[PDB]
């Protein structure tokens, strides 16, 4: 929030990180996908249903009814408008506001796209042009061209373009990949477009950043996504530990106490280097992604040969307890996290059928066309089989950005006066006035709260803020303590 010179509002700026792409295609049993879907099928704007070519029964869209469909505390009908109206205010063009919708339905349809094995062949052949037709139209595509590209992905290995055939299992999976890809991008776009409106000409002198992200969560199962988040947090933490070190040291300087101490951040640098540094996890992760014939297993070994025994924060797992398999544990400030490396290579490659993307790139639906541009502009760079996508501006890592973004962030965080807020969850059971112990205890460790207490206690435990000191104790020598507190917020307590 970009405040002006006077002190009055001037601009805003959003940025999104780590979106749960999987919901779009999946959902746990007690959960559900994004609201939008359920919003739309609610039927408050019936045109929409016919416009998108869907029904009102979600069980027609596998992608979105794997879990639950309705939530009592939510009124999908009301929201639909909220949403709707917001779009408008947000300045979107009707068309775009149309793309959004139309595009959000295509995705539903995709999950309905079905295929079958060609006879005597292990190839995938379309099981009908019922749905494709809709998906095609809704996206400003051609049914055929689409089903081909999907089935007979025309690749470019060597210096040419080699037409490759896919399996049934391969298609279903690629489709899902686009569905997710498209949704994401779109989401990104919306944000940008928002930002665009939120751009004013008026001068800006300062801003107030409000960061909302998740905190270090430990699961019996920790995959790639966990690393990314944990890493984010372990950084954020150090960010604090330092600010505190800086802060602390001012007092002892203001007062005249004689206390020497090392930055509290330092304690964490070990873990961070191991992740972000050159021969660290990410790198080994993002290099192997360049090897056309690497395995998760391959990656794994590379991870060890290089860090095992040589690095302290690096460890081989404890396979048992509440954990599900073995690969590698790390020693984060909050504790030991047991990480499972399986899918990483892929997840990190963001494999997308480029033939299809092609089609998008030349859609009749501008917006859809837009969203893909940046893929179309780096292809120059990865023209032949093997090599480096980055030559043409294509991502080389699933992780290559995350880092870039996370840096651009932690940098923005520095030219800032950090203000901290830790949100807590009392009981899994949803009951006011109650608290499970160990549940809150957990949070406290991973929060930073327990670490702030530590650093405090190194020493001089309890530390009173001056006003907080005045008010509560003025009364003790009432005349002389009140005068002190009022006369100089600090000098007072003195």
């Amino acid at each position: 929030i970009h405040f002006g010179a006077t002190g009055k509002l001037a601009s805003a700026d959003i940025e999104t990180y780590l979106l749960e792409k999987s919901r779009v295609t999946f959902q746990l049993p007690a959960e559900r996908s994004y609201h939008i879907f359920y919003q739309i099928m609610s039927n408050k704007k019936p045109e929409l249903i016919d416009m998108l070519l869907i029904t009102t029964n979600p069980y027609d869209y596998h992608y979105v009814s794997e879990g639950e469909i309705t939530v009592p505390s939510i009124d999908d009908q009301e929201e639909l408008m909220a949403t709707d109206s917001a779009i408008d205010i947000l300045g979107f063009s009707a068309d775009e506001k149309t793309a959004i919708y139309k595009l959000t339905g295509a995705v539903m349809h995709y999950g309905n796209l079905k295929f079958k094995q060609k006879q005597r062949e292990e190839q995938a052949e379309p099981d009908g042009t019922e749905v494709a037709d809709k998906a095609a139209y809704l996206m400003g595509l051609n049914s055929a061209e689409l089903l081909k590209a999907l089935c007979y992905p025309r690749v470019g290995v060597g210096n040419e373009a080699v037409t490759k055939g896919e399996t049934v299992s391969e298609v279903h999976n690629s489709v899902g990949a686009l569905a997710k890809a498209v949704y994401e991008k779109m989401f990104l776009w919306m944000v940008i477009r928002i930002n665009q409106q939120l751009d004013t000409k008026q001068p800006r002198q300062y801003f107030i950043g409000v960061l909302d992200i998740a905190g270090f969560e430990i699961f019996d199962f920790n995959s790639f996504e966990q690393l990314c988040i944990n890493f984010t947090n372990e950084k954020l933490q150090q960010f604090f530990n330092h600010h505190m070190f800086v802060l602390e040291q001012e007092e002892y300087k203001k007062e005249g106490i004689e206390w020497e101490f090392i930055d509290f951040g330092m304690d964490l640098a070990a873990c961070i280097e191991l992740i972000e540094k050159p021969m660290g996890i990410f790198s080994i992760l993002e290099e192997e992604c360049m090897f056309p014939k690497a395995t998760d297993t391959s990656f794994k070994n590379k991870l060890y040969d290089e860090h095992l025994g040589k690095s302290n924060n690096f460890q081989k797992p404890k396979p048992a307890k509440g954990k599900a398999e073995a690969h590698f544990s790390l020693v984060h400030y909050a504790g030991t996290v047991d990480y499972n490396i399986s899918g990483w290579l892929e997840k990190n490659k963001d494999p997308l059928n480029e033939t299809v993307i092609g089609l998008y790139q030349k859609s009749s639906v501008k917006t859809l066309a837009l969203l893909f541009a940046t893929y179309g502009g780096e292809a120059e760079g990865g023209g032949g089989k093997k090599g480096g996508k980055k030559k043409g501006s294509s991502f080389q890592t699933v992780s290559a950005l995350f880092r870039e973004n996370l840096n651009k962030l932690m940098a923005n965080l520095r030219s800032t006066h950090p203000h901290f807020v830790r949100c807590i969850i009392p009981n899994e059971t949803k009951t006011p006035g109650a608290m499970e112990h160990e549940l809150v205890l957990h949070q406290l460790r991973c929060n930073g709260v327990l670490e702030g207490i530590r650093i405090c206690r190194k020493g001089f435990p309890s530390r009173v803020l001056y006003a907080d000191f005045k008010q509560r104790y003025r009364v003790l020598n009432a005349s002389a303590i009140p005068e002190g507190q009022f006369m100089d917020s600090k000098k007072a307590s003195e």
Partner: protein, 372 residues
């Protein structure tokens, strides 16, 4: 992005330089590996006196300059003239300033230790690049075809090589070099085409024999009963129209030119040919790794692009290999840039960052550091 965008990949050849940004799919810059030095004093209209010319301006103006090739058979032979080609690559071709770009370079198969140290000395000390890295060419070609073990038959403009690679380490004692490549091959076509009763008299006749070789040449399988076919005279013939009308016909010689790669005897070479050499490399390697190499004959290089090269090689080594073996000749379409693409991939990769030799490593360890 700092260097995600920023990594350069320069593949130095005997005939062509291939260059561009790690990330791209193909080289942003491709140009001859020449440095022309004017035979006389004078100027072009509007320009100043130029001491030197590089790449295409050296080729185009060849009549008034003495042309020189810095890389003889894949090895850098003149370091004054190579620093000139690099300068041209960064500043004119890619138009980047080198002092803020990491640079991945390539070297040849048994490139002398001292050279890898010298181009590092010139990269860091005269171009002041942040960091650099030298990959071996066959090794980038393999890797660009996804794999890590295989044997690459690599063939460009001045050299042919066989580099058996196992889990990434190129095997020094099994590497074979055959000094007959596309350059030799254009000059042989030249003679079998003048010998067909022709004349490549002016320089506009000379240059295009090479464009005939690229467009119309073939590697026939059963080159035996292809000559026999030539004689019955089928519609096998192929006429090309010259810079002007002068429609030249090439029927037969069309494949007599790549049959030189299997029979070096066509050109007074006593060395063995491509397929035998693939094989000999292979019976020079460990026994347990020979099934791997056989199912992974990756081809790269401009001269391996002749259609039907792969089928001839397929059958050439099946019939020399023990029948218990699986033969497999991979020849991708982008193969004239395999090497480069393998570098683009590798250098844009997420894990490569920790192998870049930085000026910190260098200023502290000497050229020895990158030499490995």
């Amino acid at each position: 992005d700092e260097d995600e965008t920023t990594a350069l990949v320069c593949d130095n050849g005997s005939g062509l330089v291939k260059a561009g940004f790690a990330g791209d799919d193909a080289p942003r810059a491709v140009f001859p590996s020449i440095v022309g030095r004017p035979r006389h004093q004078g100027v072009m209209v509007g320009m100043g006196q130029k001491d030197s010319y590089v790449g295409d301006e050296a080729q185009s103006k060849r009549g008034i300059l003495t042309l020189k090739y810095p890389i003889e058979h894949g090895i850098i032979t003149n370091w004054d003239d190579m620093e000139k080609i690099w300068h041209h690559t960064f500043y004119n071709e890619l138009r980047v300033a080198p002092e803020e770009h990491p640079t991945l370079l390539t070297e040849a198969p048994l490139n002398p230790k001292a050279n890898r140290e010298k181009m590092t000395q010139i990269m860091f000390e005269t171009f002041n690049v942040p960091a650099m890295y030298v990959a071996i060419q066959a090794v980038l070609s393999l890797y660009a075809s996804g794999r890590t073990t295989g044997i690459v038959l690599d063939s460009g403009d001045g050299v042919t090589h066989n580099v058996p690679i196992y889990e990434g380490y190129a095997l020094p004692h099994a590497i074979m070099r055959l000094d007959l490549a596309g350059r030799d091959l254009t000059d042989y076509l030249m003679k079998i085409l003048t010998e067909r009763g022709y004349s490549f008299v002016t320089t506009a006749e000379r240059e295009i024999v090479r464009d005939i070789k690229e467009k119309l040449c073939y590697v026939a399988l059963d080159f035996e009963n292809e000559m026999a076919t030539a004689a019955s005279s089928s519609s096998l013939e192929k006429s090309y129209e010259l810079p002007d009308g002068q429609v030249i016909t090439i029927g037969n010689e069309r494949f007599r030119c790549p049959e030189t790669l299997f029979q070096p005897s066509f050109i007074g070479m006593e060395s063995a040919g491509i397929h035998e050499t693939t094989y000999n490399s292979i019976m020079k390697c460990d026994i347990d790794i020979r099934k791997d190499l056989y199912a992974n004959n990756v081809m790269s290089g401009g001269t391996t692009m002749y259609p039907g090269i792969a089928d001839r090689m397929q059958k050439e080594i099946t019939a020399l290999a023990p029948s218990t073996m699986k033969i497999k000749i991979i020849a991708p379409p982008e193969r004239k840039y395999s090497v480069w693409i393998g570098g683009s991939i590798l250098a844009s990769l997420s894990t490569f960052q920790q192998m870049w030799i930085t000026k910190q490593e260098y200023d502290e360890a000497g050229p020895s550091i990158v030499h490995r």
